[PDB]
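Minutes, project check-in

Agenda point 3 was the complex the collaborators sent over. CS summarized: four entities, 1564 residues total, and the question is how they sit relative to each other. Sequences were read into the notes so everyone works from the same version.
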Amino acid sequence: MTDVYILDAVRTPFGRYGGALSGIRPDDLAAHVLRALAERSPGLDPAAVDDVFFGDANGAGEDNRNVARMAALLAGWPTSVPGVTLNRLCGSGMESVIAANRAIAVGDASLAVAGGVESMSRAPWVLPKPAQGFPTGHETLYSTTLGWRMVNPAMPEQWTVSLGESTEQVAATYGISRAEQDAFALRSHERAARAWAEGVFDAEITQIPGAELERDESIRETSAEKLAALKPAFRPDGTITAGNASPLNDGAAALLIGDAAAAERVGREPLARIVSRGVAAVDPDVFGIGPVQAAEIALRRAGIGWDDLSVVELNEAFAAQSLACLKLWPDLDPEIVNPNGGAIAIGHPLGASGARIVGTLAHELHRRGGGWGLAAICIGVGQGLAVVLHR
Amino acid sequence: MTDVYILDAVRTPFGRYGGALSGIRPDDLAAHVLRALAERSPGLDPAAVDDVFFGDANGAGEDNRNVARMAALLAGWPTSVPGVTLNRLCGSGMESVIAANRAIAVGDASLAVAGGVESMSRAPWVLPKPAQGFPTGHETLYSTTLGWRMVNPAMPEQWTVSLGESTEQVAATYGISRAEQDAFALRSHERAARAWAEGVFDAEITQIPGAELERDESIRETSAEKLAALKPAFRPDGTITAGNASPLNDGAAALLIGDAAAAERVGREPLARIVSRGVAAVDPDVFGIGPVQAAEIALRRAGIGWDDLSVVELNEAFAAQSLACLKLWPDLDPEIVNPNGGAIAIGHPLGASGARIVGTLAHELHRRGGGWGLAAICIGVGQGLAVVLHR
Amino acid sequence: MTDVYILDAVRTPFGRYGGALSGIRPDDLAAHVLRALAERSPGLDPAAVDDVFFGDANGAGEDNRNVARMAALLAGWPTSVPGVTLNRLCGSGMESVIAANRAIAVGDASLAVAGGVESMSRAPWVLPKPAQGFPTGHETLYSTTLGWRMVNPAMPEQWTVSLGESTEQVAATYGISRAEQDAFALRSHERAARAWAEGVFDAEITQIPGAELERDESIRETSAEKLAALKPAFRPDGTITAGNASPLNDGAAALLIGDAAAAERVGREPLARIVSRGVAAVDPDVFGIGPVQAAEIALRRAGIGWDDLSVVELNEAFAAQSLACLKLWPDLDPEIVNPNGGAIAIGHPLGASGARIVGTLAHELHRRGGGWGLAAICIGVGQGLAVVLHR
Amino acid sequence: MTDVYILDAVRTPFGRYGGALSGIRPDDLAAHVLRALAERSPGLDPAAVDDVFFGDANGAGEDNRNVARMAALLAGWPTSVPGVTLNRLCGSGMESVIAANRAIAVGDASLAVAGGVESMSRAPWVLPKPAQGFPTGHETLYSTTLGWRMVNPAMPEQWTVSLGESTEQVAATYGISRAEQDAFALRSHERAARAWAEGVFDAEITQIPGAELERDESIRETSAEKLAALKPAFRPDGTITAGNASPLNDGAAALLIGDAAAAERVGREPLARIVSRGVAAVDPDVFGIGPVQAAEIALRRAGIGWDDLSVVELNEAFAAQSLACLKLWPDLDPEIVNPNGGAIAIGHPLGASGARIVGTLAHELHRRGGGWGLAAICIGVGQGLAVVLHR
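CS then shared the predicted structure for the full assembly.
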């Protein structure tokens, strides 16, 4: 068993849906963070990368046929660098971290890239082919942007509710009121904006040439009254709104991950050690609390408890979802949960988010001069991933 | 690091394109082999599955949004069973074995499923969204069935050549003659048909109710004459034909993978131990020989040489590709390669293939009363995977 | 008013949906009947054709952009020959007859072609474009084969019911039983088969080279018992079946129409005079009876009554629709309706039907040595057209 | 032979492509001008309309399935009002005037509506259907906005050149210089801008509630220099530009057309009498001059020469086209041509244009206290229509 380190973590600013990165193909987003990784580490010879992992919740569009591999090629890396793309929907970026982590831990790799990428803007349509010639009926052109598509008839209907509907149920079940959601959403915008303004993300940001963003595009100067005025998006009497739900976003993130040997090879002091990982799945209709058990597992494997954490990166698919996770965990000091904001403000380009929050967890642990960090991400269809870092 | 075993390995017969499985949604194919794994192992409580890994080279269709998870839900498994879908194109099924292997080896899991699924028949169309309203020109509706789509303008042209064109290049470069390819293709059909007839595949086969197959549908009674008569598929003067290339196919394979504790929990004797794996990447236009270093790496990691192998599953993307791999492995006896035929005859549903050949390797080593096995699979954009098994 | 004659009338056999003409582009269907008209009248100089009218209820596919003109060009006809395509849905082929008839009657033309064409097999899909970039939702890919599509929200819902649903209501309203409908459907098949067998359609048939049909493909050897066994197509308790409804079909018909000057110029003895025409419109949900008033109008304008008709060509959209028209035409002897069968058996390639029945009415009148004929056709959104012929 | 009058003529302003009317479904555009005809003539009982004719060059989208009928229904006219849609491409709106004219002239109708409608913004995509199940290669999704689509392989290539390219050859063949075209284009903008400002179109305009247009949206304040600055749109060395070519446009136009009895019944004094019409067809590649013979025919049928005309509405598909027509009408004083501008400035929503220019001509003739007017329109696959009016 080999210790595994985040050597570097970088990501584009996240574009909002149809926003500043909506013109950037997802394979180019992935290629770009790879480029950025190589740029950021002159001691990194890309040929030394044993495998490139990219989380990608879609892949039907321009990121098709294994975006990790395409990205390495597009980044100008040697064709000897393998790549694999992983889909654990919303958590795919953290799955790729875990996948790379495992590859190195078992000695299959010394140096790996774990990225995540989503262009939700350029999520294409998918049209099923007819099984017979001259189909007569109207077909559905499925948008891959959001939600279920080409739903299996045998799939229990209660599991195919929208993520927002599921999260409404979770909010109702766990008593996550609209005000707590909006308070959590507001804090996300406040901390994300402050983190950006104070240069907190400078360490982890690569700008797309010609598509620069001063900060994550979904970050707003908003207010409790502004969020309170929004209409519910999933139920007429609902609590989830566009303001306390994550946006749909574009972006990519990539982490350089190696063992101690790779760290010296590349010439980089690890941001943090990947200690442990956890995965959990729940009823799809409460997917937002998917990470609850995953985080418990990761913490236990790391030999620590909630009190040992100095940073929690809990991906904010929805304020309600994040709050429900927090309600199922021991009280965490608010200051440590998404200290620099989260996906409500920063954006949630599915494949990218799980890599981003591990990467920014690592940077944050580096800024704090050490400590235990937990990154946890809920997944659609009811899963959760968690990674424990230690600097 | 824990020893990891293939506890069971099952697959559907593979349907040919538009063939006997073409009416079965790929998420249903994956769900079927999961159901079959649970039926096959009465001591398997599906709640014991820590993760479900499915290789899937496509996933834009009915298998969208993490088919591994979809499959587990569709199989009636507890919502607690997580699922992750991996794309290393044609090697995805073996990537997923390796993913599962690593998860258990590091102790993140004790029991896992590593499957692969592809419905190449039902590979949908993909239509990119317009960035602007009221686009004016004719658009391309991309088929996801084969080859490149929504090609990045920056992707080197030489790397986007068709798999067959690349294999023609590899055939020429390594002197793989048309007769040699067709001899290898003929042997694939003969061995596959014989294996079916002699019950060799009964250990690994699950029938789809209502879509049963007497044998893998692409298996033909054929001859050197019939093969030599075929027109070239990729060049007027070419060597690759429909006959010495794998078909496009539909199928799923799934392996129950566990450590010793899982084997005891599930009450199953390991078919074989997963000893090691390799990954390699090469110029995309020589993808056919992608497995070469991967096998070498895997063998090195397993502490064995080619002489120690008693079975090799070399996935038969193209006879020429496969023969080129054997040439670059001079020390390998070609008569222990694909003893029961391969993908030329059995079919090549991309995502399932890498799982199938590991699974059938395990069964073969079980039939032979033990020994070292190598499974190797080339991947389309210049990659290769290899797994070494020991019973 | 100038007297206007049907100089010739030809049609392809009608192929069944996805049947023998499904490989023929509709513009080629139309061009073929133009070539046939030209072949059939050696005295016809195509340059003498003042205008080509084609009924076509679709036109979204390969018959797009004025199939009439396209067909004239594809038929080798001089570029001097104008062409116009008319859509009065199911009655479009009769509309073009009337259009040609009017053009000549007023002296805008002396010689015209009135055709109708439909390739219901090749009826394409229509995808509306997004008004903004990066559309988010699932879109409908509308089949143009059948029914309403791209339905205006403001269209009264009662009017957007399917033709079969509407005709179920009409069947209930007018007491047209299942057995009555099947008897009329049987009658259609028997008379159509008999007409073909006896060479009655030889006078009007042109065969597509390479897609020849022994007879109209939808004609079957059926029986009261087979028809009674058929399941209802539009309600669990309904009376309309696939057997007592017209099929979906492909086919083209074209009539050479001219005044006496044209008749002499072309060297053709008129089959029949086009005496009069009627149009009417009803609630879309009783479209089946749209012809009722249209026929009354045409009869009144011809100065004749139901008494005086020796042949009625009532397009058989549905047995129940045709029977309802008969009930509402109590002075009409049902016996003289569709003596050579109708669309239930011959097929109903929308655009072609209204021209076919006028052309076959002219031939029948010719066979009978003269008399008054009425052709009437119901139209999908609540219309009806009728033409009175006299030889 | 009954005298036939334009009793009213109305149109929407024309929005440009993607412009102010781009949110209005074409059937609603058509329905709107119908509602306006009813609103404008309170003596009009819409049930008195015997037939509604609409030119529509597309019909693939929301105006599918006989937009004339659909529009009558959507306008809330009695379901007894029939409707028919006509496609002679660019000339469809004039075809429909002619169709209504003929219906009344022969006594089939007393009161008719002749409309034209086009939403080129909302021109949908069409996807041909597979003849066989599970098609495998990329497909073309055809836009119906402009030009040829689903081209017949048997159509001579010479006839499938774009409209711009054809007009380039015509402009070359008839020595129509860039400057001459731009002068004509400038003049169209100047006269159309002036006509709007002076209130000239107020008599014929109906605004779409919520989509009001101060004037036709393609009218611009332009200049000889701005037009001279434009780059050629169809050849490197070309003379045709986006500025001397019509735009793509949305709009609808509708004429209330009746005999003297209808005029008295609706309580409307005729704007003009429809005296005659012409149709002609030419080689597709010189379609711009299609109207030339059509106008000659119509004049000769009206008993007049060019000298007699006080107004000519020549549809401006291209300045070069329009000038070549003028060139071939040597006895036509070009200064009476499009006195209020033309399609270069007003816009060219194909199906609407032929109705608009007849309608505008009627209004202009009314505005001048009588006279002879000619409307002519070239048509894309080599045709032309002409209508002679007289007040």
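Noted in discussion: The first strand of chain B starts at residue 4 and ends at 11.
Follow-up: revisit at the next meeting once the mutant set is ready.
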